Design a protein around this ligand. Structure first.
Ligand SMILES: CC(C)c1ccc(O)c(=O)c(O)c1
Ligand SMILES: [Mn+2]
Ligand SMILES: [Mn+2]
Lengths: 409, 552
């Protein structure tokens, strides 16, 4: 069994448990009574000062409640693993179909370093503080923890070897409680291989991981930056155009607005139609060109956090951008929709956060830190109510209405 | 003896508290050896040989002016040096969270902390010395054998041991509800009066078989059940008017007992503001610290004291019915709400004050109220109440669909109880045809703070105005204000201030800033207002013109 520790000179996680509905508290009590019986977790005393939040979620589709521990704080306090840690397959994104499987269940089979158990403490809250908190700590590889897939690496390899050798061409990436299986087979056989990979795990050693979260990376589209094309512009159109090209000149140094502004010479009514000059037309053409080739120099850097900004665009539409350095976007997309008049802004945003974090895992092998267009107190209240992933990314809250909303269409 | 001692560790790298004993009077010592001799007999403490190396200061003082001397130990260095524990949810159970049970009984377990053993290996850090009178003999050295009072670990360790003791009586009676809060043990049930008393007899013996004297009663009054400050009646609970101390010089150890009270009362009583009295008091420790409050604290204690002067009544929770929450708009950043199941039978009534910030508007405040109520309800009842709110469904729709941020309210219905919350002004999405276009700009000189604010328009109209003691950010809002002033009912307004755009694109309807307000009002008077934005110094006409006019 493996020796783990916290980064040098820092103490463990002491986060507070947020309130849970009655429904959720009940499910957690069931799940934990079982787990205590199976020897996975053990009640602890008050001499253990640490704590990690814990709530419950239903997955994409199940009858069933899944205990989700928010280890975010323990994760960034857990010594990175190198003495091990996983490699990301750049080919995964290029595949026609990628299915995600919950193998997390398998982590419970490996014992956790006796001395590291205390740092995994958590508490099930009681309604109206009738009873004081029921407290546990893990004795095994806890799901949602990063030190988990790291220690179950050798074990996970040995289990997939036969499938790898025989099935050599699929790509299999392991992230947290997740296993990303990608292939260029047709959905029929692709899903046969999966079920085949499924059986492999059931045979090689909560409980459901029956389900496939199937994605199609080969069909994910980036949104470029475009400029309107009109037969008659107004002072206002031109003013907007110039404001945006001036913004796009921070990313593409070759942008020129000279000949366009020159069209706004004097002081006109915003609704006045201004004819386009040859000079202007050309400048518009040339800029239009430049805006279609990629940014000059943006390769991904693994030792740096990823950053994702989201812009509520209205009518259920959302745009986002991932980057490490400002104006050096690795990706930009537009999350059009759930299909309609989606009446829960907060739900849409929570769905967008997960999709984006998914795409991010597939492409760089890690989750981005989010800058969310919401009031912290509104997000903290309702987000766990729409969460369906087994992982949780880092986020902050944007209080100041950005101007880039006006430009990322 | 029957209880399993909890393992306790001093903080890492820290050693035991070596302290010096303060000499005492023959009258304070004699007593002590008395209070001690008895304590040593119950086995609460032991005499240590000459040889332990740690020490804690021992003091001895009065309990009533009906004079006697009780014992006081200064566990200050030791509380610094002792491992952190988990205060768990230092949450406070709300009477309205209790459900109607028939029979109830409150057992006041307090004397029990002395009755819990202390980790054998840790007892040596609790050594204290009783000074000798003429220092002709060696002092007398005791160490603690039970959770010592005044220490870090007695609170949590005991409240924990208790749980373990009760957790077996609790499992055996799936129907009986038991809640523990400090001294207090609440036992509820639907049983007849006489089967209840019976079980209570088993619980009492079960606690005794684990080695802790239950007190039963020495002055026996009625069914008005007293459980951690609440008066529990068959079908209603009551909190008697809280009497706050009235005094000349406030102390740091009476001001601390105050915030605790205020907090406790904070969730029973509405509008209990305690944020000023906490900023005078924290992390500063006293041999010699004694405090005047600040005249914003004698006036608050004034307001709190006025609110705690009226009794609080409420009904219990009936899980078979919906939970309802109704809010009304009260003013000056104030809102009132009542949570109930049956109309006029309130479970909890409260008040929400606006959260600090320069600009704001009624809609953002209501939303903040809902999420506060929502979270409070989930803590007490485990569910989210339905909301009766003073805002049209059409208003809210217009708001969240257009607001640049993500926002949501739970299931809710409109209730017409003026003053209704609404949107005072609405910026347009497109330019307004036939309206005058006001390109505006401003500038200021940081050295002299002298600046100008102007605007030019497609109709030739123009105006610049000199200003003193102003800023760049100030002058662009000032320029907008001027534009709003001199324009008709409908108006297009081009600016180059990202700052001004930020403030207006937030749609505020009161700011604690006179200027913004002036603009706000001006907006409320307009029928149509289209507010554009352009980059500065890029040659767009009429941004340049006006820039030239205000720059120099
Ligand atoms: C070019 C810089 C100094 C600048 C920034 C912001 C403004 O609002 C201005 O009006 C301006 O004239 C200049
Ligand atoms: Mn300006
Ligand atoms: Mn200017």
């Amino acid at each position: 069994t493996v020796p783990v520790k916290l980064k040098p000179g820092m103490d463990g996680p002491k986060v507070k448990q947020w309130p849970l509905t009655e429904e959720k508290i009940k499910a957690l009590v069931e799940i934990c009574t079982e787990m205590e019986k199976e020897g996975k977790i053990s009640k602890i005393g008050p001499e253990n000062p640490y704590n990690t939040p814990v709530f419950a979620i239903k997955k994409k589709d199940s009858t069933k409640w899944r205990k989700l521990v928010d280890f975010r704080e323990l994760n960034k306090r857990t010594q990175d693993f190198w003495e091990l840690g996983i490699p990301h397959p750049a080919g995964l994104k290029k595949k026609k179909s990628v299915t995600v499987l919950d193998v997390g269940d398998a982590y419970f089979s490996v014992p956790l370093d006796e001395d590291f158990r205390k740092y995994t403490a958590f508490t099930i809250p009681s309604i109206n503080n009738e009873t004081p908190g029921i407290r546990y700590q893990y004795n095994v590889l806890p799901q949602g923890w990063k030190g988990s897939p790291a220690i179950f690496q050798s074990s996970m390899t040995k289990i997939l070897e036969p499938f790898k050798k025989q099935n050599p061409d699929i790509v299999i990436y392991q992230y947290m409680d997740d296993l990303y299986v990608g292939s260029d087979l047709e959905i029929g056989q692709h899903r046969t291989k999966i079920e085949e990979l499924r059986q492999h795990l059931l045979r090689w050693g909560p409980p459901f991981l029956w389900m496939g979260y199937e994605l199609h990376p080969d069909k994910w589209t980036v949104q470029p930056i475009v400029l309107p094309e009109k037969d008659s512009w107004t002072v206002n159109d031109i003013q907007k155009l110039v404001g945006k090209l001036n913004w796009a000149s921070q990313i593409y140094p070759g942008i020129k607005v000279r000949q366009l502004s020159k069209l706004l010479r004097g002081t006109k009514a915003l609704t006045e139609v201004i004819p386009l000059t040859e000079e202007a037309e050309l400048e518009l053409a040339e800029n239009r060109e430049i805006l279609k080739e990629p940014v000059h120099g943006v390769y991904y850097d693994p030792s740096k956090d990823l950053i994702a900004e989201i812009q509520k665009q209205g009518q259920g539409q959302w745009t986002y951008q991932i980057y490490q350095e400002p104006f050096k976007n690795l990706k930009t997309g537009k999350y059009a929709r759930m299909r309609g008049a989606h009446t829960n802004d907060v739900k849409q945003l929570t769905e967008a956060v997960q999709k984006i974090t998914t795409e991010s895992i597939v492409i760089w092998g890690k989750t981005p830190k989010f800058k969310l267009p919401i009031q912290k107190e509104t997000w903290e209240t309702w987000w766990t109510e729409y969460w369906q992933a087994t992982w949780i990314p880092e986020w902050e809250f944007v209080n100041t209405p950005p101007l880039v909303k006006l430009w990322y269409q | 003896s029957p209880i399993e001692t909890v393992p306790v560790k001093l903080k890492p790298g820290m050693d035991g508290p070596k302290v010096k004993q303060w000499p005492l009077t023959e009258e304070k010592i004699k007593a002590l050896v008395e209070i001690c001799t008895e304590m040593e007999k119950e086995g609460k403490i032991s005499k240590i040989g000459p040889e332990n190396p740690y020490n804690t200061p021992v003091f001895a003082i009065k309990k009533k002016d009906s004079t006697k001397w009780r014992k006081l130990v200064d566990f200050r260095e030791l509380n610094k040096r002792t491992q952190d524990f988990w205060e768990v949810q230092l949450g406070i159970p709300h009477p309205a969270g209790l459900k109607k049970k028939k029979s109830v009984t409150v057992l006041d377990v307090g004397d029990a902390y002395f009755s819990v053993p202390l980790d054998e290996d840790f007892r040596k850090y609790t050594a204290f010395t009783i000074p000798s009178i003429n220092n002709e003999t060696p002092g007398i050295r005791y160490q603690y054998n039970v959770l010592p009072q005044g220490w870090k670990g007695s609170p949590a360790i005991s409240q924990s041991s208790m749980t373990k003791i009760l957790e077996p009586f609790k499992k055996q009676n799936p129907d009986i509800v038991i809640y523990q809060y400090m001294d207090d043990l609440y036992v509820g049930s639907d049983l007849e009066i006489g089967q209840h008393r019976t079980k209570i007899e088993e619980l009492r013996q079960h606690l005794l078989r684990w080695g802790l004297t239950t007190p039963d009663k020495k002055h026996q009054k009625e069914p008005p059940f007293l459980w951690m400050g609440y008066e529990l009646h068959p079908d209603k609970w009551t909190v008697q008017p809280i009497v706050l101390p009235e005094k000349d010089s406030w102390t740091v150890n009476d001001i601390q007992k105050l915030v605790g009270k205020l907090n406790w009362a904070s969730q029973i009583y509405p509008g209990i503001k305690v944020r000023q009295l906490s900023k005078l008091l924290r992390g500063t420790k006293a041999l010699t610290e004694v405090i005047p409050l600040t005249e914003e604290a004698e006036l608050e204690l004034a307001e709190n004291r006025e609110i705690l002067k009226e009794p609080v009544h409420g009904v219990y929770y009936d899980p078979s019915k919906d939970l309802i929450a109704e809010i009304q708009k009260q003013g000056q950043g104030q809102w009132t709400y009542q949570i109930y199941q049956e109309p006029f039978k309130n479970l909890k009534t409260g008040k929400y004050a606006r959260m600090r910030g320069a600009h704001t508007n009624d809609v953002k405040q209501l939303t903040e109220a809902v999420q506060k109520i929502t979270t409070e309800s989930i803590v007490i009842w485990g569910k989210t109440p339905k909301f009766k709110l003073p805002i049209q469904k059409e208003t809210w729709e217009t708001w969240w669909t257009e607001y640049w941020q993500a926002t949501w309210i739970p299931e809710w219905e409109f209730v017409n109880t003026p003053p209704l919350v609404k949107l005072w002004y609405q910026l347009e999405k497109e330019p307004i045809v036939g309206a005058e276009t006001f390109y505006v700009d401003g500038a200021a000189n940081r050295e002299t703070k002298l600046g100008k604010a102007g605007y030019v328009t497609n109709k030739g109209r123009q105006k610049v105005v000199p200003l003193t003691n102003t800023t760049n950010q100030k002058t662009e809002l000032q320029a907008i204000y001027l534009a709003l002033q001199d324009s008709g009912l409908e108006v297009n307004i081009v600016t180059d201030s990202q700052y001004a755009l930020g403030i207006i694109q937030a749609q505020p309807d009161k700011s604690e800033s006179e200027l913004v307000n002036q603009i706000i009002e001006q907006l409320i008077k307009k029928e149509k207002v289209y507010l554009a934005w352009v980059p500065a110094h890029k040659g767009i006409g009429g941004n340049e013109q006006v820039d030239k006019l205000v720059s120099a």
